[PDB]
Design a protein around this nucleic acid. Structure first.
Lengths: 79, 77, 852, 86, 74
RNA sequence: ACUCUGGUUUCUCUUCAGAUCGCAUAAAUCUUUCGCACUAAAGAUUUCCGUGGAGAGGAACAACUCUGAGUCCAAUUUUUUGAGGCCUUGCUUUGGCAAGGCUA
């Protein structure tokens, strides 16, 4: 039984680049290496970049704080 | 305990329909009616907003996207 | 419909609405041992669902057990159906069809009638007495009928107010009971999927006297209600099974801390129950209000003035509330008619699931072909008309609808045992009142009216002008065998017809009753015991025929057998002087007849598997294992017919032409028997030779059937014949001191005591014995009177054992009225029965031969 | 304090307009703290509420039976009349 | 109170999930949480154009969870 | 959590009472039954021993225990918002309505 919070903690401890999809907005998602998470789903992503699938553009913002209400799904990425 | 959650739990074992917020209406046997509005049915016929209908061997809709539910009124009287 | 009905918590429209949905219906049979609380449990449920019905402070009201004889005796006699709407733990109301069966072993047949139309079994076990004889018998019968099984451990208060056991010892007693039930189930069922344990919710702990009904889930929900933050399912998972609780870490661990802490069950469940009961019974006036406040129960001044037993009942009703644990147990584990239809069709329907109509019934769809199946016949108060009670397996029965009713002899090839009848009315059968309804969908119990005429025991209701391939359901296989035989006549022969009518009626009221007329014009009733026949005769005298009836003393039905092969190869020709059949008779191997009776072998199997079984289990020759023709008189009859005719001497094709006639003659001869017209048991018949006339008109029909019976009789007689008494198994629940006295009683009635083990956790002993049925008359009364009523016994048919004497001994002199000594008891049992049947004074070994 | 505002419309036929724009007219036989309503004999109409309609009074009317209106999509409610005897 | 979703029968079984914004995924449920956060092992998100992209095991929140459909026998 | 009835004890009268009116048990009369009726059964009536229910009246001291009635929750799953803006088609009650594709 692998829970989602334990998988999110393992992905934060591994430092791998994960991509989070926006809730109610699938045209643009975020990607980066999350250093830690909070109890309200807020995570601290290092080297965060907003990738829009409609235009094929990437805008980097640096150290960002992602709220748990805006992110709907989170997956793993190689880059 | 609410009257609607008690009516949803008492509606298990019979045929009922549930329409979500996106217009998807799944009709079938209410296998599991949780207190959080989670409706799990087995062999439910799901009709979307476009009009196409399909059959699922086991469907489970969460309570966050629940719009309305129509069950039999014979148990209320 | 619209009619006057008692005030109930739910509404009749809701009850009718639940019937349409077959996923919310539970067909449940509450079975168990005598006086284990089933009827009181049903009464508690009725009180819960009927606000106006209240149990008397002194007399335990019984909503079921409505008969006058049941009320006077205090022993359940007939199964009572009750249809209610019960709320679950989550609050979801389920439709429950509960068949309250009698606990007495003599009426075990009644339970069988309640097991054919049910999907689940709830076995009630006394927490003090534990597992008894009827509980074991009902477990075997239920798991052999392919039914889901759950357990209600009733009368837990006896562990607190009678035995005064410590809570850990009470837990040990309950665990031992559960383990013993699990062992019995595993012994009677090859599959180990249906392990019973209160962790799985299969087991509920109850006290119907004080309305203390709870399972682990329900009582964990009580904890959840008093403390919201706890989830009841995981807590119920942690409550049972030697899992200790650490309050320093608030965690449940298999390792016991402090070496003195009690289990989770004892700490959280048993100890609070003990505290409640002790506070009510011991510290009422001084310390009851504080504990009542701690539990949130508030009682009025008039309610606190009650006696201790009513106060316990009230307090435990307020605490535990509704019997939601029972509903959970019967919802999660007992299949609905939708789910459980397939096993029922595969087990009971004669055509099998593979048939088209079997597939139709597997769905239990209300809008299908009508395939109702009634197994009970309930007489009205006036006793003139009968209502056929049973479940609807497919389609929907409507009031005022033409119906084809199929009897037990109805077959596709011979449809004569079928009658077109018009249904009069339909009732949903609650115990003391009936809810008239217009229709009943599939998966529900119904009292069909107007179909009682063409049926005696079992019916197959279907719709006419359809279901041309419909077959009947298998007739009720009964747990025990009806043995005790009584002759019945009227005081005034002028009113003979009335009694005859009464006989018919009792034949309908009692599923296992057998009423016939012998060759001497003597009306014969077969029952399972003296209490069973007492109830039968009370019904025959008061309910059905109001005439005075003389009853002969009770005698048992003996069996006939052989102990060694026939001296010479017996033979018989047809009256045509052709078709010579030469046979011999030999006894069967040990346990072979038991294998045949217990369905271990079936003639319906193919030749390959039957031959393989007879070759490996009993080491028969391949030719001998493949030449077997039929099993005894009936299907799976204790006797065996084989032909040893080598193909060189007899044409197998020609013999197969007369095979049906020879098998019919064999079955008839084994059913009748030549000693005293009694069933021939455990005899192997070998056809040594068979001449057959080539022309069809000189064989078959009335030529070869009587010839086969004659040659069977000769082969049986030349082989050394013997009689089998029926031996009953007796379980006596007696105090420790009385055990010795019990032996004394069984000393006077040829009783052999097999075991005298004590009851763990109880101050009593269970003396098991094997008493002859013919000597069992008054044994129960003798034992109870000799021991001042402290010892109670229940006798049930166990086996057939050879009578010590030799029936064919003309040298024995028998005085007309004297208890004969053992060495010639059989000689007494053969001639006297021969006089009761109306046959000749004695039978000669060459009576059926051809030389004389 | 009293809480009779929810019990005054209980058992009577009320017509409630949800957040999606549909109008459900049925006997309000069940309520809750989350605003979840139970409509026995409930009919859902999405075209318009028929109030003295000269051309038509029932457009896109669907009968459900025992309808369960969720309180999350509730917007407003209106009283139509008293309930029947049956 | 605070009960999790009914994911014991659907756990370890390949089923499809519907996420908000018209998202569709298919994978094996490796577990769930009390806030509707489930683990999808071997997840393959089906795009609107018809092609499916395998993203592996991911964490799906319970806020945007539309409905789950079991693709196997429960 | 604040207000208002219903109080208890005892005496007497009336009426109902198939309720084990009574967790006890008598007498009388008549009929019936076989002996040949304290030493005997059945059926019925009645009278005594004395109760319960309801009502009424009297007087004794208690007046709100009880029975009731009237009277701490912003971060998923409902009530502290993915909320608003663009285009096309049928009618325009020329306000906009119904559906779909979007941007957020």
């Amino acid at each position: 039984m692998v829970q989602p919070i334990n998988l999110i903690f393992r992905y934060l401890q591994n430092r791998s680049r994960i991509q989070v999809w926006l809730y109610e907005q699938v045209n643009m998602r975020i990607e980066g290496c999350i250093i830690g998470f909070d109890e309200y789903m807020n995570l601290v992503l290092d080297d965060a970049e907003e990738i829009h699938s409609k235009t094929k553009s990437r805008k980097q913002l640096g150290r960002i704080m992602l709220k748990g209400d805006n992110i709907t799904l989170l997956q793993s990425v190689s880059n | 305990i609410g009257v609607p959650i008690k009516v949803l739990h008492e509606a298990e074992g019979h045929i009922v329909t549930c329409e979500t917020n996106t217009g998807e209406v799944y009709r079938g046997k209410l296998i599991e009616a949780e207190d959080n509005m989670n409706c799990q049915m087995s062999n439910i016929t799901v009709t979307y907003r476009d009009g196409r209908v399909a059959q699922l061997e086991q469907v489970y809709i969460r309570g966050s996207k629940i719009r309305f539910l129509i069950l039999p009124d014979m148990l209320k009287n | 419909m619209e009619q006057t009905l008692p005030v109930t918590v739910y509404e009749m429209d809701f009850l009718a609405d639940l019937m349409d949905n077959s996923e919310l219906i539970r067909n449940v049979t509450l079975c168990g041992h005598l006086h284990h609380g089933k009827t009181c449990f049903v009464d508690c449920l009725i009180e819960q669902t009927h606000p106006e019905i209240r149990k008397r402070y002194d007399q335990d009201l019984c909503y079921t057990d409505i008969l006058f004889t049941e009320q006077e005796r205090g022993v359940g006699i007939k199964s009572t159906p009750v249809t209610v709407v019960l709320p679950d733990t989550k609050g979801k109301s389920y439709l429950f069809n509960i068949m309250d069966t009698p606990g007495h072993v003599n009426f075990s047949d009644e339970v069988t009638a309640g097991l054919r139309i049910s999907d689940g079994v709830v076995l009630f076990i006394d927490a003090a007495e534990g597992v008894m004889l009827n509980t074991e018998r009902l477990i075997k019968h239920a798991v052999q009928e392919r039914l889901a099984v759950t357990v209600c451990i009733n009368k837990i208060d006896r562990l607190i107010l009678e035995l005064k056991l410590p809570p850990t010892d009470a837990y040990y007693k309950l665990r031992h009971i559960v383990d013993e039930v699990n062992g019995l189930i595993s012994m009677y069922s090859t599959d180990e999927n249906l392990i019973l344990s209160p962790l799985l919710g299969n087991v509920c702990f109850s006290s119907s006297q004080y309305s203390i009904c709870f399972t682990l889930g329900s009582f964990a929900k009580i904890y959840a209600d008093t403390f919201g933050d706890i989830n009841y399912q995981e807590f119920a998972k942690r409550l049972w099974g030697d899992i200790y609780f650490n309050p320093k870490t608030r965690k449940f661990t298999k390792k016991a801390p402090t070496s003195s802490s009690q289990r989770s069950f004892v700490e959280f469940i048993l100890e609070p129950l003990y505290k409640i009961l002790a506070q009510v019974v011991g510290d009422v006036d001084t310390s009851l209000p504080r504990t009542l406040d701690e539990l949130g129960i508030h009682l009025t001044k008039e309610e606190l003035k009650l006696n201790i037993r009513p106060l316990l009942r009230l307090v435990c009703k307020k605490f535990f509330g509704e019997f939601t644990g029972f509903v959970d147990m019967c919802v999660q584990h007992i299949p609905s008619p939708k789910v459980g239809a397939k096993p029922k069709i595969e087990h009971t329907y004669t055509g099998g699931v593979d048939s088209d109509l079997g597939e139709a019934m597997s769905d239990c769809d209300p809008d299908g072909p009508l395939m109702c199946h009634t197994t009970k016949m309930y007489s009205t108060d006036d006793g003139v008309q009968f209502h056929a009670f049973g479940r609807v397996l497919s389609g929907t029965i409507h009031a005022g609808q033409p119906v084809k009713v199929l009897g037990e002899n109805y077959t596709l090839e011979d449809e004569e045992d079928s009658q077109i009848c018009t249904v009069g009315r339909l009732w949903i059968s609650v115990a003391r009142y009936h809810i008239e309804v217009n229709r009943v969908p599939a998966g529900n119990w119904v009292l069909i009216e107007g179909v009682d005429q063409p049926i005696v025991k079992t019916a197959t209701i279907t719709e006419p002008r359809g279901n041309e391939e419909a077959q009947i359901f298998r007739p009720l296989k009964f747990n025990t065998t009806s043995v005790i035989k009584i002759a019945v006549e009227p005081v005034n022969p002028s009113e003979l017809p009335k009694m005859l009518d009464g006989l018919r009626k009792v034949n309908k009221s009692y599923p296992s009753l057998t009423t016939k007329v012998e060759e001497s014009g003597e009306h014969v009733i077969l029952g399972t015991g003296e209490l069973y026949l007492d109830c039968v005769m009370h019904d025959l005298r008061k309910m059905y025929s109001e005439i005075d009836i003389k009853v002969a003393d009770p005698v048992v039905t003996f069996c006939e057998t052989v102990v060694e092969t026939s001296s010479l190869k017996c033979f018989a020709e047809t009256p045509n002087k052709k078709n010579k059949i030469t046979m011999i008779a030999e006894p069967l191997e040990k346990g072979l007849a038991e294998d045949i009776e217990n369905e271990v072998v079936q003639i319906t199997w193919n030749r390959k598997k039957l031959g393989e079984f007879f070759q490996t289990k009993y080491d028969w020759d391949l030719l001998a294992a493949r030449s077997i023709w039929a099993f005894g008189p009936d299907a799976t009859g204790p006797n065996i017919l084989v032909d040893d005719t080598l193909p060189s001497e007899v044409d197998k094709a020609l013999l197969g032409s007369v095979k049906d006639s020879i098998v019919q003659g064999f079955q008839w001869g084994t059913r009748e028997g030549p000693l005293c017209d009694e069933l021939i048991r455990n005899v192997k018949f070998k056809i040594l030779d068979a001449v057959v006339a080539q022309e069809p008109l000189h064989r078959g029909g009335g030529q070869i059937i009587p010839t086969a019976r004659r040659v069977v009789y000769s082969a049986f007689l030349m082989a050394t014949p013997r009689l089998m008494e029926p031996y009953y198994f007796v379980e006596v629940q007696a105090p420790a001191d009385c055990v010795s006295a019990v032996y004394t009683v069984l000393a006077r009635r040829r009783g052999h005591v097999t075991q005298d083990a004590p009851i763990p956790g109880s101050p009593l002993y269970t003396i098991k014995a094997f008493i002859p049925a013919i000597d069992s008359f008054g044994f129960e009364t003798d034992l109870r009177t000799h021991t001042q009523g402290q010892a109670f016994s229940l006798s049930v048919f166990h086996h057939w054992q050879i009578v010590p004497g030799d029936p064919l001994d003309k040298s024995i002199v028998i005085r007309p009225l004297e208890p004969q000594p053992a060495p010639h008891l059989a000689r007494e049992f053969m001639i006297k029965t021969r006089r009761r049947k109306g046959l000749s004074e004695d039978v000669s070994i060459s009576k059926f031969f051809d030389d004389p | 304090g009293k809480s009779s505002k929810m019990l005054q419309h209980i058992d009577y036929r009320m017509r409630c307009i949800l957040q999606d724009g549909r109008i459900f007219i049925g006997t309000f036989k069940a309520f809750d703290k989350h605003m979840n309503l139970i409509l026995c004999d409930c009919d859902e109409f999405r075209k318009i509420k028929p109030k003295n309609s000269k051309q038509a009074e029932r457009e896109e009317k669907r009968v459900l039976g025992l309808v369960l209106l969720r309180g999350e999509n509730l917007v407003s409610m209106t009283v139509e009349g008293p309930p029947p005897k049956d | 109170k605070a009960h999790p979703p009914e994911l014991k029968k659907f756990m370890d079984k390949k089923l499809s999930l519907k996420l908000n914004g018209g998202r569709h995924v298919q994978g094996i449920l490796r577990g769930f949480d009390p806030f509707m956060n489930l683990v999808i092992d071997e997840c393959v998100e089906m795009a609107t154009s018809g092609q499916q992209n395998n993203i592996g095991m991911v964490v799906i929140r319970g806020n945007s969870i539309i409905m789950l459909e079991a693709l196997e026998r429960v």
